[PDB]
A paper describes a structure:
Recently, a unique binding site for a cyclic 12-residue peptide was discovered within a cavity formed by the light and heavy chains of the cetuximab Fab domain. Here, multiple crystal structures of meditope peptides incorporating different cyclization strategies bound to the central cavity of the cetuximab Fab domain are presented. Collectively, the structural and kinetic data presented here indicate that small perturbations introduced by different cyclization strategies can significantly affect the affinity of the meditope–Fab complex.
Other cyclization methods, including the formation of a lactam, reduced the affinity but not to the extent of the linear peptide. Flexibility and geometry dictate the special organization of the β-alanine linker, which has the same number of bridging atoms as the disulfide-linked meditope (eight, including the amide N atom of β-Ala1 and the carbonyl C atom of β-Ala12), while the aminoheptanoic acid (AHA) linker is one atom longer and the diglycine linker is two atoms shorter. As the distance between the cyclization region of the meditope and Val9 and Ile10 of the Fab increases, so does the dissociation constant. Of note, although there is a significant error in the estimation of peptide concentration for AHA-, β-Ala-β-Ala- and Gly-Gly-linked meditopes, the off-rate is independent of the peptide concentration. We speculate that the increased atomic radius of the S atoms is responsible for the favorable hydrophobic interaction with Val9 and Ile10 of cetuximab Fab. As expected, the affinity decreased with increasing distance between the linker and the Fab (Cys-Cys > MPT-Cys > AHA ≃ β-Ala-β-Ala > Gly-Gly > linear peptide), underscoring the importance of van der Waals interactions in this region.
Residue numbers in the entry:
A (entry chain E): 2 to 11
B (entry chain A): 1 to 213
C (entry chain B): 1 to 133, 139 to 220
Write the structure that this text describes.
């Protein structure tokens, strides 16, 4: 699921 | 709407290896599919248009294939700069929809973390709050333990961790553990230790300081 | 050189409006259409809408009512306006341009605009030094107690990038964010070189340069 902080998927 | 299912959720390979990303459509979309790369804190980058057509500036190691419902993005020889998320997009049907994406992780040799401990600055102590930061730098794999001790008392619940994404050059991780105390608590104690457990260490490494040296 | 630059990262009160400006260069808005795409934890990448060369607008089905896209061809600006924002509208918003005027393969993107939907108020961060003490010295800055995200951190006005690690922001129990940015340097350069972290929290117009010296 997308992380707004890193713009990466966790 | 067209549902695009990307598999797997996570891909873990080694540099120089081939890798394939899957993208499956709920129904036939011909070859109207586009691929995207997204690195840390970046915007999507166009890799492949219409299943197989190449894009300007994009490395020749990127290619795509497939038609109908089953599509594949391929990297014949993974490099450390390939560490990113990869999305697929269809436009045979309105509206254009994106897949959930696949995370590409890279394997490498075990790297022991370099540990640094940082006392709270005198500037922050004026706020009535103290932050003690422990830095685990350039290590692999991601798994690591940070144990905080204040005057031999085990700290628990008063620390938070942050981990960088995989480095695009050396494929390592860095970790920061921040112990948060009140200025009153911090002044009541002397020895502040940070113990680090990792696979690359044959023994737990401890960095510590006495308050006021 | 084709470019798209969006307006600064913003906080939006619940049930209020969101406004983002997309300023383009390297091409004319009369020749290409500008699309809008968002990225959220719960919905991933999501196509929102597009304003075409002729000024026509298409809005994705669940946004037709509260979405509104406009532009000024002369000023090369595209105006994105969405009404009635809720928490699940919290996402990163992009403006984008396709390869060809009629198509949807997005080869050009804006840097993104992190939108946070909250009733909370904006607070600038405090910047504290992580003072250094095998011939390699570690130092950094503690960017603490700010809202909302994001905050930009660089070193020596962009001249220092090698060895820099800016950690992801963590949400504290206070509802305020906090992060640290570190960098490894030769310990013999601590006397010669000056090290400054350039902190910028645009949501609150807080811009701080913090000099980090050995205590």
């Amino acid at each position: 699921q997308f992380d707004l902080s890193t713009r990466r998927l966790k | 709407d067209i549902l695009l299912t990307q598999s797997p959720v996570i891909l873990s390979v080694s540099p120089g290896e081939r890798v394939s990303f899957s993208c499956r459509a709920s129904q036939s979309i011909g070859t109207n599919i586009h691929w995207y790369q997204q690195r840390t804190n970046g915007s999507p980058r166009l890799l492949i248009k219409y299943a197989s057509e190449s894009i300007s500036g994009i490395p020749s190691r990127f290619s795509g294939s497939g038609s109908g419902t089953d599509f594949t993005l391929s990297i014949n020889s993974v490099e450390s700069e390939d560490i990113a998320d990869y999305y697929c997009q269809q436009n045979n049907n309105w509206p254009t929809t994106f897949g959930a994406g696949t995370k590409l992780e890279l394997k490498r040799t075990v790297a022991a973390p370099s540990v640094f401990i940082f006392p709270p600055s005198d500037e922050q102590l004026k706020s009535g709050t103290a932050s003690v930061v422990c830095l685990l730098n350039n290590f692999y794999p991601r798994e690591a333990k940070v144990q905080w001790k204040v005057d031999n008392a085990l700290q628990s619940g008063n620390s938070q961790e942050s981990v960088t994404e995989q480095d695009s050059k050396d494929s390592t991780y860095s970790l920061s553990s921040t112990l948060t105390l009140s200025k009153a608590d911090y002044e009541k104690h002397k020895v502040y230790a940070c113990e680090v457990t990792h696979q690359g260490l044959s023994s737990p490494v401890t960095k510590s300081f006495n308050r006021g040296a | 050189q084709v470019q798209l630059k969006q307006s600064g990262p913003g906080l939006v009160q619940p049930s209020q409006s969101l406004s983002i400006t997309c300023t383009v260069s390297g091409f004319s808005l009369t020749n290409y259409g500008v699309h809008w795409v968002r990225q959220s934890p719960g919905k991933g990448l999501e196509w929102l809408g597009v304003i075409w060369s002729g000024g026509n607008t298409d809005y994705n089905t669940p946004f037709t009512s509260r979405l509104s896209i406009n532009k000024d061809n002369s000023k090369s600006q595209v105006f994105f306006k969405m009404n009635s924002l809720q928490s699940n509208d919290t996402a990163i918003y992009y403006c984008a341009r396709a390869l060809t005027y009629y198509d949807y393969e997005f080869a050009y993107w804006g840097q993104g605009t992190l939108v946070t939907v909250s009733a909370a108020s904006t607070k600038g961060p405090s910047v504290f030094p992580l003072a250094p003490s095998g011939g390699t010295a570690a130092l950094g800055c503690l960017v603490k107690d700010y809202f909302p995200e994001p905050v930009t951190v660089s070193w020596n006005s962009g001249a220092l990038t090698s060895g820099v690690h800016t950690f992801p922001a963590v949400l504290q129990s206070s509802g305020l964010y906090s992060l640290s940015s570190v960098v490894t340097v030769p310990s013999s350069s601590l006397g010669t070189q000056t090290y400054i972290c350039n902190v910028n929290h645009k949501p609150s117009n807080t811009k701080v340069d913090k000099r980090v010296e050995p205590k």
